[PDB]
Structures are given as C-alpha cells and as structure tokens.
Enzyme design. Sequence first.
Site, PDB file in Angstrom:
ATOM      1  CG  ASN A 190      -2.023  -1.063   0.986  1.00  0.00           C
ATOM      2  OD1 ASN A 190      -1.899  -1.964   2.211  1.00  0.00           O
ATOM      3  ND2 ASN A 190      -2.385  -1.699  -0.037  1.00  0.00           N
ATOM      4  CG  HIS A 192       1.580   3.297   4.162  1.00  0.00           C
ATOM      5  ND1 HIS A 192       0.611   4.125   5.128  1.00  0.00           N
ATOM      6  CD2 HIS A 192      -0.050   3.005   3.237  1.00  0.00           C
ATOM      7  CE1 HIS A 192      -0.220   4.493   5.054  1.00  0.00           C
ATOM      8  NE2 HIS A 192      -1.035   3.829   3.340  1.00  0.00           N
ATOM      9  CB  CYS A 227       8.759   6.911   8.598  1.00  0.00           C
ATOM     10  SG  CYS A 227       9.608   7.474   7.805  1.00  0.00           S
TER      11      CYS A 227
END
Lengths: 269, 268
Positions: A190, A192, A227
Amino acid sequence: GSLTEDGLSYKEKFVVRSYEVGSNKTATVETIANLLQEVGCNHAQSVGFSTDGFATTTTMRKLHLIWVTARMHIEIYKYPAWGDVVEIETWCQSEGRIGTRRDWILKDSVTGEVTGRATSKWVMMNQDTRRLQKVSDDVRDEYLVFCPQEPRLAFPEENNRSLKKIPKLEDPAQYSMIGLKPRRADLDMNQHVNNVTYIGWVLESIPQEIVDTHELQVITLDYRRECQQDDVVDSLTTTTSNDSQFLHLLRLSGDGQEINRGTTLWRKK
Amino acid sequence: GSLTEDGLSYKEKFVVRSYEVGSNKTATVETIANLLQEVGCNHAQSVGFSTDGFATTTTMRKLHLIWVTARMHIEIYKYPAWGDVVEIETWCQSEGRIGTRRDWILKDSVTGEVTGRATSKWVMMNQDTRRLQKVSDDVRDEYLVFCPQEPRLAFPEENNRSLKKIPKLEDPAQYSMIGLKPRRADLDMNQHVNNVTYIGWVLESIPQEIVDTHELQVITLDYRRECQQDDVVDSLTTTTSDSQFLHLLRLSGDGQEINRGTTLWRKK
Ligand SMILES: NNC(=O)c1ccc(O)cc1
Ligand SMILES: NNC(=O)c1ccc(O)cc1
C-alpha cells in the site's frame, strides 16, 4: 501453511534463506519479524479475509476502518540457522473494546523445542482521518468466531515485559544514527513503510561492538506515528543497565516529532 | 529444491510472500534478484561447496580467491503475484579464463510458461588485496565437472542486450536520489553490502510517475567497486529514449563510480 484442527490458529514452516541471515549465519530479528507478518497474513487469508485489507471485516471496509500496530514484543531464545526449518503458530484474540492481540510461537521443526515467542497489540483507526477508535460490538462479533474463547497467551507471566510502560529517552542520547530514510524496498503493497523497517531503524543506533559480542534477546517497540515515504528519521539509544539493556527513540529529523519508542535486552554470547 | 536428473542444473520453487510485493501485488525485481541469489546458493551447496565461501573450490580457499559479480542482467515478462508459486532453474558455465557465468530461467509453476530470464558474469579476485587477476588451469578443472559441456544460454541471440557496453552518464543528470546509505539489513552474512541493494539504489532515482505507470522489463547492471558499510551513495538517472534510462551510482563525496546500468520500461 494451514489452520490447525479446531480452526482457531494457523501454522506455517519456513526454510531460512542465505540473504536472511547475519554474521553468525542465523536469521536476523528483522527476518523473524517479516516471517511473523507473513504467517499473520496467511492466517487472515485462510479464515476468509479479503486481499483489500489485512483482517478487515465487512463492516470495517464499509466504515473505512483498518487495524494498525500499537506495539510489537519479540523474545528469541535461539535464532534459526541458514537452511534450518522454523515452524510458526499464530492466533488472534479480542481485547474488549481496546483492540485486538496477535500472538506467535516459534519452534525448531526438527526438535519441536520453542525457540521464540511474540505478541502484538492492534488498534482500530479510520483509514482517511487517522482517528483511533474503540472496537464496536458489530466488529467484535464478526471476528470473535475466528478467536479462541478462553485466553491463550504467548506471554502468560503475572508481570511480564510485554506489557511494561516505556519512558521517553531524554537528550542527550548516548548513541545515535541520523538521517535514516526509507527506499522503495522498505514500503509494503500500500506504499506505507513496513513495520519491520522501524525495528531496523531502532537497531541502527546500537553500537557495532554490542552487535558483534551480544545476542539480541528481547525487543519491545511502541508505534506512535507513521514515517512517510518523504520523511527522514533519527534513531537514538541510551544504555539503561552479563546483560545489557537499552532505551530507544525514533523521531523525525526536523521537528523531532516522536514516531517510536522501545527497549532492547541483550545477553553476552 | 533439487539438482535435475543429469546433475548439471538446479531447480527450486518459491511461494511469493506478502512483504515481497509492490503496489500491483506482484513481486518486485529486488525480490526476484534475492530469489536468483538464493537458488544460486542452494545449487552451490548441493554440488559439494562449503559454507565459508560461495562456489569457492578447494584451490580457491587455499589461495584466498573468491567469485565477485561483474554484471547482472534480468528480463521479466510477468512478475509473479502474491501467493503464486514461481519455479527457478539455474546453471553455471566456464567462460575460458575470463571467469564464470550463472544463468537462470523463471517459470510460472502452474502454466509451465517462461515468465523471466537472467544471466550474470563473475570474475575471480583475491579476497585480501582485491586484485582481479583471474586464472583457470586448476580452478577451471575443479568446477567443469558441475557445468554443461555444450553451451546452454539463457540469452542465446547473437549481439543481445546482456552483452551490450554501457556508457558513463554525463553531468548534469536528469534525475537523482542523494545520500543513500546501507543499514544492517542491507548487509550479507560477511558484512558486505548485498548485490541486490545496488539494484534498489539504481531504481531510487527513477521518478515515481514512471514507477506508477510503467512496468520494469529489463535491467543490466555493471559492478565496478563496492560500497562499504560507512560509504554514502548518489543515484543518477537520465532518459535515453517504451522508456529507456541510463544509470550511475557513485560515492557522494569524491564521485568515484561504483555501478553503471540501463533499464527498459513498458507502459502498463
Ligand atoms: N539478532 N540481531 C539482529 O537481528 C540485529 C538486526 C539489526 C541490527 O542493527 C542489529 C542486530
Ligand atoms: N518492477 N518494479 C520494481 O520492482 C521496482 C523496484 C524498486 C524501484 O525503486 C522501482 C521499481
């Protein structure tokens, strides 16, 4: 991999790969954490969950709600050698309205001996607004059918290290690794940052002399904020202690916003 | 995994993992490159090689000689999806006194269809001095017994992409990613940067818009010098055209070249 007889847990065997091992030719804790994540995914797929979201029920997808890791706690007694087969068993449990827990047991496939254990706390969050929320009765009912009804804990002990509060590291840190940034291989499907990347970043500020002479026994990591793909992180570490203990902090390089805090316990080889 | 009937090649199946895939839920080229490396190791172990050095024969260990990658060339037709089983076949061949070659064929285990192919050039180097001076006589006779005698090539075509000379990118680069540094997960069991990390670093300077709208078809990478655990690298890229790119990895300070390469991408 396969669900066990009762369909309330899942087991999978892995052959440790050449690129998955460190200097002592045994699997790294990051390899172990990736395997825990993989067996978690295979368990969710086996009990009917979709490929759109990890363990997201029909009601969760309708409300744009996702599970997010709040804490990961891993204890390793023996890291599997290169070429060895490790068997991992995983299961889930509801924790009232707080969230859910996923536990793991690692075994040497040849001896049947427990070589490690892990536990993780997951909270529900709106995917769009990022607002945390308690688990609703409708969601709790939809996943209870896949969890054991009586408690089954990887860490049973009355006051065990998996539930201990972690303090915030105070400046100045004893050690640090600055300007850490993720590359495309650090991202998940995704886009991330993968939760395991944060473990690597925490461990970056441990001195090479500790890494070369000690074995990592326990790591507890709290996840506070994400992050982003364009963020830069600083990893800070201070010794708090035969055994060495450390306090850890990951924060954004600029403003110093906390992203993670943790502790590690190491034993002399 | 297992050696084939004649004992001159090795095959192994892999189930693509959740963390091994990108945004289209198919394996990344770095996952593919790690699998090629893994099947290469399992092949060397199966034919009798020791655990202290990759494909190092008895005479090589005595002389402190190791095999080092000079070039990697990979072509993917279809990246395997998450949960799919990919079968990889690998074999080695002596290339006179120049060095050795390792080839791979990737297949979809269900259809039997070839989904990718790869080839790599390896040179001999003294492990202590880092001097390339590579010989054959004793060494070539010790490993010829594990290689096919007639040529078997993953890239047979005369004057094909895998053997094409790569030019040096001239400043200014069109795109760049600066200050790339390895972490402990990027190192191998000998504390050296893994060859696959260099592929990731090359690809870092490709814009996100190309990555989101194109599929990577071919990557050819030349290895010139190693990045040490305390080195910092800059990744440079310029479009030379399907989209084609020229690549350069160099040390952030003095600008010493560590790698050069080319990538070919097709619109999705
Ligand atoms: N068991 N030790 C490990 O896997 C480890 C991983 C990363 C580090 O930076 C240090 C130690
Ligand atoms: N097939 N594409 C890939 O695996 C890929 C990997 C890393 C990148 O920075 C860009 C592309």
